[PDB]
Amino acid sequence: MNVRATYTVIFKNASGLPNGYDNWGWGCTLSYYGGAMIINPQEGKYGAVSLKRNSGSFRGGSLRFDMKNEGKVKILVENSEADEKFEVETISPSDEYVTYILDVDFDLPFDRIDFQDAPGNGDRIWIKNLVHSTGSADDFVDPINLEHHHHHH
Ligand SMILES: OC[C@H]1O[C@@H](O[C@H]2[C@H](O)[C@@H](O)[C@H](O[C@H]3[C@H](O)[C@@H](O)[C@H](O[C@H]4[C@H](O)[C@@H](O)[C@H](O[C@H]5[C@H](O)[C@@H](O)[C@H](O[C@H]6[C@H](O)[C@@H](O)[C@@H](O)O[C@@H]6CO)O[C@@H]5CO)O[C@@H]4CO)O[C@@H]3CO)O[C@@H]2CO)[C@H](O)[C@@H](O)[C@@H]1O
Numbered sequence: 001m002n003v004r005a006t007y008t009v010i011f012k013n014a015s016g017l018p019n020g021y022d023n024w025g026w027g028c029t030l031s032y033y034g035g036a037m038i039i040n041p042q043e044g045k046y047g048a049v050s051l052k053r054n055s056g057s058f059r060g061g062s063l064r065f066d067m068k069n070e071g072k073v074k075i076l077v078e079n080s081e082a083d084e085k086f087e088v089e090t091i092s093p094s095d096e097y098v099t100y101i102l103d104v105d106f107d108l109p110f111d112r113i114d115f116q117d118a119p120g121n122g123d124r125i126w127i128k129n130l131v132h133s134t135g136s137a138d139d140f141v142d143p144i145n146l147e148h149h150h151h152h153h
């Protein structure tokens with residue numbers, strides 16, 4: 001048996017929603033520039049992007065992404081069949097991109113990945129380089145595709 005993780009690059013540079021995903025989000029408008037998904041939540045809506053994998057689910061593992069964000073951002077996953085949600089982490093503000101690699105300890109499969117404006121104050125959120133691994137955060141190695149190019153030596 002192959003014990004290495006499956007890495008799913010959901011998007012690197014975003015110029016729209018990733019192929020294979022719908023947005024079941026709420027209370028926001030999304031724009032795309034400079035390879036970032038830019039979320040502008042509406043004041044008072046506790047808005048979110050909710051990326052819905054149209055075919056299949058993820059299980060456990062970890063989520064990796066670059067984010068900058070004016071306010072706290074709650075990361076959730078959901079199982080749409082059971083309508084069950086799980087808070088992965090709430091991330092504090094940062095005025096520069098930070099790479100996060102977060103364990104997902106939820107014990108149902110998930111088909112929705114949510115980035116939510118936790119304070120409901122309309123703080124903007126920028127996301128790039130979103131990847132799921134079936135392995136742990138401690139075992140996570142960035143996919144070669146995330147490099148600006150890759151010319152193998
Ligand atoms: O169209 C495609 C598809 O749609 C299907 O229907 C989907 C729909 O598209 C989708 O949008 C919807 O998504 C749900 C999601 O499943 C829920 O988990 C989510 O729940 C939100 C909730 O809406 C928010 O109100 C709540 O907000 C919290 C906030 O997280 C928290 O930080 C805050 O606390 C405050 C507190 O209130 C203050 O007093 C003070 O203490 O400050 C704190 C912190 O600020 O409070 C907020 C308010 O309570 O967050 C939760 C969790 O994220 O809701 C969304 C939207 O409804 O899901 C449906 C499926 O059910 C169709 O079914 C399908 O046919 C169609 O094809």
Ligand SMILES: [Co+2]
Nearest residue numbers: 144150152153
């Ligand atoms: Co190589």
